[PDB]
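hey team, just a heads up i'm posting the complex here instead of the shared drive bc the drive is being weird again. everything in one block, sequence lines first with there labels, then the predicted structure for the whole assembly after. its two chains so it's a bit long, scroll down
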Amino acid sequence: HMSNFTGLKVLVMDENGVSRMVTKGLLVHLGCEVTTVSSNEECLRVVSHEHKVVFMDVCMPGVENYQIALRIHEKFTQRHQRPLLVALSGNTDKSTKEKCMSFGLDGVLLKPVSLDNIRDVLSDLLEPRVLYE
Amino acid sequence: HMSNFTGLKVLVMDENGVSRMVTKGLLVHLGCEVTTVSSNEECLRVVSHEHKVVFMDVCMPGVENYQIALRIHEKFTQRHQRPLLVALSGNTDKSTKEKCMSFGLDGVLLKPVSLDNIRDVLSDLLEPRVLYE
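-- predicted structure starts here --
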């Protein structure tokens, strides 16, 4: 497991201030350097290689909120690695999972979020994995 | 599942001709465009963004054969994505797994190899994955 991400450069994209604020607060308690944005256009100019992870809100109906992740893949396709994309939603049913895959999200968090679901995901995403067989 | 990788740009690095030859043959039957090399120095100059996957042999004792994967991570750290690294070994016990992780290998194949273990790995590596929670 992995309990703290002290120094983790992460970005939060959420149109809602409270949600954005809460999310930043949790990440800060875990030791993250959190940059926040509240619009897609803003997310695209701010997101840099500095950011190891981008948590984005996807609670709008359909895939309106997933487009930004595609736009984000386009951008880093400059020298540095594209950041890991994590979606923030009210569900994780097939609906959501399907969308994240086709749209490039690497992980998904169920809302409201807690240190608990945040650690697990950041741990999985950040920790070494090898597909044996 | 995923049965054919027609058009898959892959590279094979193996000092042994037969092993290198066999591996290329299997990948060609699956539809891959296989480039092969037989030395580390050679692997480093040939490996390009063209290559979506690099299968490398790691049967030397210790981690002598894993170094090339580190050297490969260094290189793409230019614009294009680093290729997925797959190790070819005679075992998959903890010994191997530990090494692949610390050295950046994304997957590992047990030798001798077969279309079977090749498909599974390429499928997992290549197919969309999302860490929900």
